[PDB]
């Protein structure tokens, strides 16, 4: 009225391990949303870096040709 051997011990160990995770994780939804927005920001920053390197190289590599073509004419 109040309420295979190693299975109960494993269940108790799993329960104790979950209790050792007392850090509140009911906000995992908004945590994953913040993770997603921060990863989107990181992808935009990586795109910024790659386009910046492309600009740095292409600006000079095109200005050399522009000058060499304009000065002669």
């Amino acid at each position: 009225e109040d309420l295979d051997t190693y299975r109960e011990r494993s269940k108790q160990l799993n329960e104790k391990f979950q209790e050792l995770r007392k850090k509140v994780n009911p906000n995992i939804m908004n945590m994953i949303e913040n993770v997603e927005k921060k990863e989107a920001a990181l992808k935009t920053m990586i795109k910024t870096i790659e386009k910046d390197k492309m600009k740095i190289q292409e600006t000079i590599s095109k200005l050399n040709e522009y000058k060499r073509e304009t000065l002669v004419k």
């Binding site: 295979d4 109960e8 494993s10 269940k11 799993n14 391990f17 979950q18 994780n25 995992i28 993770v35």
Partner: protein, 49 residues
């Protein structure tokens, strides 16, 4: 440098999410096993009674 120094916190959050989901699944399986064991023990106690 700032991003690679904060990346420890990103990995800590990834752990606190993945291990949290794993612990939730383990707690579900433990509740199922506990219910099965409780049913078996109740049947045995009823037979003994």
């Amino acid at each position: 440098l700032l991003t690679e120094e904060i990346e420890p916190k990103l990995e800590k959050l990834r752990n606190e999410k993945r291990m949290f989901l794993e612990f939730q699944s383990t707690q579900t399986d433990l509740e199922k096993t506990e219910r099965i064991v409780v049913s078996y023990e109740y049947y045995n106690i009823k037979h003994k009674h």
